[PDB]
Amino acid sequence: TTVTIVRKDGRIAIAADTLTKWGGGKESADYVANHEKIIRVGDSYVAITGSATFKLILADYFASLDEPPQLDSVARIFCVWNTLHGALKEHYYLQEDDLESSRMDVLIANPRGIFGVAAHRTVQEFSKFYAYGSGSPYALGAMYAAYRAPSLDAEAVARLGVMAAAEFHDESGLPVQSFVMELSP
Amino acid sequence: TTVTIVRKDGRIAIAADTLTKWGGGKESADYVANHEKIIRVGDSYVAITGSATFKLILADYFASLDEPPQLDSVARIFCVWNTLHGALKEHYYLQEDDLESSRMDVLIANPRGIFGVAAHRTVQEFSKFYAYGSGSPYALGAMYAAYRAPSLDAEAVARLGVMAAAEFHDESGLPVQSFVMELSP
Amino acid sequence: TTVTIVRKDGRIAIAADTLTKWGGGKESADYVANHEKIIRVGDSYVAITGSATFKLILADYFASLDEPPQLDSVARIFCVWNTLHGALKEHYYLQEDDLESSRMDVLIANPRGIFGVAAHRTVQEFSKFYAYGSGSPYALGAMYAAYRAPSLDAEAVARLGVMAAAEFHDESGLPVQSFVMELSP
Amino acid sequence: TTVTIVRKDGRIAIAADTLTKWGGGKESADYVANHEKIIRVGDSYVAITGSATFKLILADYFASLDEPPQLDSVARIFCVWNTLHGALKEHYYLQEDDLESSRMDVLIANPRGIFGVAAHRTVQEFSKFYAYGSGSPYALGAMYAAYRAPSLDAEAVARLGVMAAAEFHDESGLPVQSFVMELSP
Amino acid sequence: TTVTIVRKDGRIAIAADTLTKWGGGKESADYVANHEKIIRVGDSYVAITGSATFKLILADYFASLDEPPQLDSVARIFCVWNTLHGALKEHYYLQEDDLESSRMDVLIANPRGIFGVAAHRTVQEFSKFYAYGSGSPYALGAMYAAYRAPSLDAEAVARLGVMAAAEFHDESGLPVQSFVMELSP
Amino acid sequence: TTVTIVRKDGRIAIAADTLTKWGGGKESADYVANHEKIIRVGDSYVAITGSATFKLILADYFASLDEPPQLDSVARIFCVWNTLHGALKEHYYLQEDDLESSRMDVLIANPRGIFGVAAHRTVQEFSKFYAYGSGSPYALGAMYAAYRAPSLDAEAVARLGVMAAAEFHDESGLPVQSFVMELSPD
Amino acid sequence: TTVTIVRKDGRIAIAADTLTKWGGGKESADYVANHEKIIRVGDSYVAITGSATFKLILADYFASLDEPPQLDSVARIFCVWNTLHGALKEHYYLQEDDLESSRMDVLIANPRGIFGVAAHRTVQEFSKFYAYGSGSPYALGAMYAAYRAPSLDAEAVARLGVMAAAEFHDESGLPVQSFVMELSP
Amino acid sequence: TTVTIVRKDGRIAIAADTLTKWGGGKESADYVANHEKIIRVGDSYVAITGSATFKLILADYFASLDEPPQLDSVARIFCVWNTLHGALKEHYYLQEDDLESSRMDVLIANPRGIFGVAAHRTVQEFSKFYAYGSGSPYALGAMYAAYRAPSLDAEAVARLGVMAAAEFHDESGLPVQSFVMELSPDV
Amino acid sequence: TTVTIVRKDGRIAIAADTLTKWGGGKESADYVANHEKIIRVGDSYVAITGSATFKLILADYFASLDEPPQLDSVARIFCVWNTLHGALKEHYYLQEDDLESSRMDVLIANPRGIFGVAAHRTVQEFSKFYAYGSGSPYALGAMYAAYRAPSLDAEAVARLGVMAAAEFHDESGLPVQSFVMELSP
Amino acid sequence: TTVTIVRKDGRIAIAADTLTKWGGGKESADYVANHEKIIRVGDSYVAITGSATFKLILADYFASLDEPPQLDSVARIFCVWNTLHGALKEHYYLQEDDLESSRMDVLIANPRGIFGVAAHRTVQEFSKFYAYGSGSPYALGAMYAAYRAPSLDAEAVARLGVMAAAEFHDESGLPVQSFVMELSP
Amino acid sequence: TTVTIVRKDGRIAIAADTLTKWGGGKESADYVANHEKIIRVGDSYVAITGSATFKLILADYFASLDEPPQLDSVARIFCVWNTLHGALKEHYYLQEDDLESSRMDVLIANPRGIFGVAAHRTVQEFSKFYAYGSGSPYALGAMYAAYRAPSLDAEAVARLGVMAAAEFHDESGLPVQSFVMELSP
């Protein structure tokens, strides 16, 4: 998996590759209908790495809440993820470290910022771009190279990061899925 | 075990081999009468890999419910399987990974699509064909070869996948059980 | 232990060796008065492999029930054995795999058919013959060779499989106990 | 420890050595006054192997029951020992296998038959003789040789078994302790 | 991580580097908005090492109390941290040693002293300076060498320790955050 | 793999299955041309179990000796195999137990008797029948039931042994190969 | 890696993928110039699996020999590979099992037939087709499905085997290379 | 395996069961023609426990010697077994303890006495009887009971030892093989 | 470490970072005079990853050889490295895998092309660009995104590769060292 | 520690060394005031081995009982010790074998007999003498030799046993403490 | 095994038990004719613990030397044993610690003194008595108690040592073998 997220010229963009793995087996977007790794939660886009089951768990979990959660500040995202964690263990059968791992790394894009939440509930707000998943290093290199290119908007930089992972790494694959939105004032 | 599933030209088919193993020993359809690995649940056909007990657990479990479940969307199937897993542990004595394993992979065929659930509750809708079990690589290769052949409908492609596995792998054996049905409007 | 079961010409038959092992030590029928490995439950004969305590546990357990179970279908036998596993744990101090093990393989004969239940509660109806225990490989070989000899009825076949095991394996011993009954049409 | 039990010519006999061990330490009857490894439980004698504490546990446990248990059939003894195992865990601090081990093998004599219970509650009725404890192979050897000698009665045979073990094995020691009773009609 | 704390000439200062790590990967203040490792708690500054999630947990935890805690004495800080540790386990999913580790080392600067709390709740009041995190040995050496330079106030000595750590260790990176305040009478 | 050997009424027969395994993968005589597990060594037939490479090693080893070895007495077969084991180690890259394993269980049929050499160089002469390889229990069961049937000669019994194994075990498969010969006047 | 070999209608064909792996890193023919996995040895084609270093080793070794080897019978191939194994260990730094592993599986095409040599020096002549490498189960299934299709010649079958593998497994990737030759009379 | 050795009334006897094991598989004398576990070496009989290969190894070894070994004192037997052990490692592919195991226990009967050599080359002369193999304890107990029965000679006692083991232990089986000889008049 | 190599518009460029690591300690070019990771070998530039000792070893090795090696084809490079490995073991104290590891990955630039040798003597000629060392994922990412930009020659791209690694990974550090040359006809 | 108990000529005696160990450190009676290893319980003396804390525990435990326990028969002692073991775990933080170990061996002298209780609650009545602690072998040796000497009474023998252990074993040290009493009629 | 050595009133004695052990099995001097554990070497007697094989080894070794060794100084005995240890490994197949172990402890009595050599070739001369083997503790204690007795010579004392260990420990057994000699001037 590679997920990327970008902030540039008052535009916020998020992207994901589409390949699932089952061991060394490839399950591409060509063979799986529900191959999207980005789900909608309220007005946030949430890009998920880790087991392919997590996008089904989160969609189900968030949908089961009274209202969709606020994912627009670090404190709020953390607060939601910490509560999400107890549900993973208690309801969705989640299984050395400082803290217990939630086993997934997510990126969160919405009008009010670009964020990440690492497996250990390390919430971060990003200023330019970041990437998660095993393809992250490839994405970061490529986005670093093309971030300041005037010809590329946020979305094109996001997608380019996923493309670089997909070129070099066996856990990412084309096509790329992406979304783009305007930064709120 | 090999189970395959296929969707082609308005037809949905599902196929399983019929060989059960006890260690290195072979328990073929010629010696076991109840050698079918596909069960009926409502209007769905569920093909089951993993221990030969699971088809008895699932048959028992589903026959226990008030109404047959809904197995025609990813969201629905996921919910049914996430409830099934709790029952597996509690009432059926099921025994590292991100999430707990249900220790079986199933394929689901009905008039409203073809689906799969891996052991870790990864629910997937398939667009063409797929296969589970130790034999599935073989099945995948054979169905890739044959999917587009004009003389072969969905059922014949699914049956060929199991044959392929049964030819080269020691956990699959003939005869092949298959079912076919029309895709609904 | 070797236990066998055969269905031929409208006659069901079941058979077992009589030898108990205590480590390398041999505790034969000549020294042990309760050397029988087949018990009666309702109108079924149940031949039991594993620890020699299991025949005592099952007789005790099935006698404690309001009435004997029906062991005449795959579905029914599975219900019975899944409940029995619960009891083995809770009342009889029973102690990796997909499902928890019951530590015993059994064959079941009654007029309505010949069945088996493996340690992981894999219930199976057999069409010709089968065998359980460390001796079964020997028994199946012998019975495969002898099943179609006109001379030999169901009981003679069952018995011969146990003899073969006793000839060549150190956990099986003569004499052979066997029971025969007519196939309920 | 060696204990034997023999039935011959209308006589039943039970015997035990008298040596206790504490590591490589010897604690003979010369130094220990309570060196009896056989106890009385109603009209039954129970010869006990394993930890030297079990004779105390059993005596104390059986004394606490409203009445002495009937120990004169395989089924009855099994009931008793199954309930006993619970108490060993629950009251007397008892600590791989099919079933949990009670950590002792016993022989039981009474006027109605000879029996043994192994650590995993394998209750057995014997036709001639048997032995338990680390000295049993020596004892069985000896009693096999002596059993048919007309000049040796049941008790002579049972004692000779214990003698043989004490001759050759470092966990068995003289004097031999034996009891005899009449076979009921 | 490096955190330093300094007391000199009626002035109290606290510093931290800004670099976060994810494996061998660097997440600098350049890419992470919330790169601050120091938080406010009443009129104390708390500089936190260990998992980057802890600043989120602590901020969240202290915020949830009725009033901010008094963190101006060795006795009071301990009491607070002890209670905090319970919460870490009970609410924030905190997972050999003398006592349970809290998995973080902190420094506390307020107007009424400079303190630290190691991971096993060893509370200490410092009289000159100290440093925590993987970069402290570097910090202590640099601060040792510069404590008594008249040109350098408390905050210059605090920042310099961090700089030294950033120069030589792969878990510390510039910029240096810092705060200064007056000693209370 | 299953190999059977049988001695009955002045006839000697030897039989083997034909299936080779690569993990769980099957490699039947339908796909492999050289699927035979029995080789000829002089006027002996030698049925081999263990790695499919051993029949290549053995053919190669024996062909390289001045003449084909005498394999018609326990003592002679032993000397041959003890010397063979040194060559497995030195020339063909063979890798708890009392003795070193040769990693291979063989049956040897010839006009002068039926023999077997187990992996630990246990040389036996059999008087009726025997089987080696993972399928052998099935083979022993079957041949036990059939050995005394008048209608089945040494070869029929041997083949039936292999059939039984192939019927029930995942490392044996049809077709059966077999050879039969006359017992020498000894 | 996937390599295939096929014999059909008087023609022999051999085929390989071109992708090299470095952990999860992909090194496709698009970045690597020397991406061929098939080499010429005399008038044979040899398709190589295992470490990408093996093709260089064999090229080097065979080029060093006085005459190109004859790879046209099982016995011949066997002598050649047995001697090769000695050179792997001795000059090329080659590093549980019955026999030492040579760590690579090869397929050999020449006009006298199609052959294979597994890691353990298992020389096999094939009659129809075969495949090696981690991709081979898929290739086997594909080639099984297509082998008797009259519209596909030996080359088309061999290539399809590799394409099947590259569709579904992460250690195989296009382009496919192939070679075809005449069977000799 | 069970091997027994007995010295009684001026007579020396030695016995053995005839069953081989391959795992939990039985290879009885009914199916194996060379089921004997006792070999002649000069005028000694050597009964061998452990892997069935050892009887083949030992016959080969002793046949290759210039002259049969004299196996009629403790010091002579030790010397032979110590040399043998070096040959077991060097020529016959033998594989924690004080000393290296030879992996077999043997009993040696000859006119000049009855002896045993355990796996660690512990050579013993026996005064009455003894047994080796997994079936020894059963054989010992049985011979303990029957040694002084007046109707039984040394051979009957040695054989009885084997039969007790076969009765109760899965690694020993009938028939029993045995040999008997005269105690020489110089001992 | 990061080493990159680029082939573009008739020019060949090779580049490396300058940071040495001693555990978590940083030894930057600022503090180390011999911080260069590229050395000459003939007219070839060879960039070296793995232990900082290796450049001293190869310098010493090649300086003692007869005539410099010709590192201008795969076969030749392989020949040279295979023999090098024998010397690393024998004279320079080198210490699962198919082949023994040489423990360093190198890139090789000369006018006749660009090449790489991985730890297991896997010689590849590259057609566009590549990277080795723990930073290479970042570098490959970056260089993928910049390779086709007309404003950036071979050297600019190679350099950008290293910059990317150093931005995000703790084992790579600025400044970048690089060399460019002409492709020979 | 060594503790001994002796019965001779109508007298009972009991003794113990006075040395405590802290690792290889010695804590003699000369430095430790409460160096007694024997306590009073009713009219019984109880000599205690194992951890030096046990005598405090037992003294604390027995004092808290409504009245003193009767320690003058095997059945009664066991009863007492079995209850005690419960308290050790629950109240005094006591932590493979048949039964749980109470981690201490004791000897009990009273007017009505000599007894012991080993760690696993083996209660014994002795007829002459016995010893416990790491020094017991030495003490049983000395007392064996000196028992029948008319110049030594029960106390001299008991004291000589401890002296023998102090002579030769590094966990026993002089002085000896001893008590004597009259055998009751 | 117990061996003892004693020097008292111008006489020197040495003793040993006669029991051999094979596991838990006893081989008493009633069953083994060569049950002696003391051998002659010149005018020394040497008592041997460890495997029963060692007395055969030492006998064979010392008989093979040109002359019996001098064993009447610590310097001389050490020389002899150091050389002996080499012969043990080289000719007699002897198999963590400071020094290699010879795996036996011996006592050596001659007219010029009494000595011992421990497993690690610690040679000692004793002034009164000593003991080796697993029974030595019991023997030392007994000899400490008896050494001064006016009616017991050195031989009586030596034998009493052994007797005490045969009494209490499962690896020593009666009869005792002893020799005696006059201290030489």
Author numbering:
A (entry chain A), B (entry chain G), C (entry chain F), D (entry chain E), E (entry chain B), G (entry chain I), ...: 1 to 95, 101 to 190
F (entry chain J): 1 to 95, 101 to 191
H (entry chain K): 1 to 95, 101 to 192
From the paper:
The second hitherto unknown bacterial proteasome family member was primarily found in Betaproteobacteria, hence its name BPH, short for Betaproteobacterial proteasome homologue. In this study, we present the first experimental characterization of two bacterial BPH proteins. Their crystal structures reveal homo-oligomeric double-barrel complexes with internalized active sites akin to those of proteasome and HslV. Unique structural features, however, like an elongated inner pore loop with a highly acidic sequence, distinguish BPH from its relatives. Confirming an initial hypothesis, our cluster analysis shows that BPH branches off from HslV and appears to be its direct descendant.
In crystallization trials, we obtained for Td-BPH a hexagonal crystal form diffracting to about 2.7 Å and an orthorhombic one diffracting to 2.3 Å. The higher-resolution orthorhombic crystal form could subsequently be solved in space group P212121 via molecular replacement, locating a single tetradecameric double ring in the ASU. The tetradecameric complexes from both crystal forms are virtually identical, and most of the sequence is resolved in all chains from Thr1 until Pro-190. However, in both crystal forms, the center portion of the pore loop (between Gln-95 and Glu-101) is disordered. In summary, both BPH proteins unequivocally form double rings with 7-fold symmetry in solution. Prominent residues in Td-BPH are Thr-1, Asp-17, and Lys-37, with Thr-1 acting as catalytic nucleophile. Lys-37 corresponds to Lys-33 in the proteasome; its function is to facilitate deprotonation of Thr-1 (28). Asp-17 assists in this reaction by orienting Lys-37 and making it prone to protonation. Equally present are e.g. conserved Gly-50, which helps to provide the oxyanion hole that stabilizes the transition state, and Ser-139, which forms hydrogen bonds with Thr-1. The S1 pocket, determining substrate specificity, is of hydrophobic character, priming it for the accommodation of uncharged amino acids.
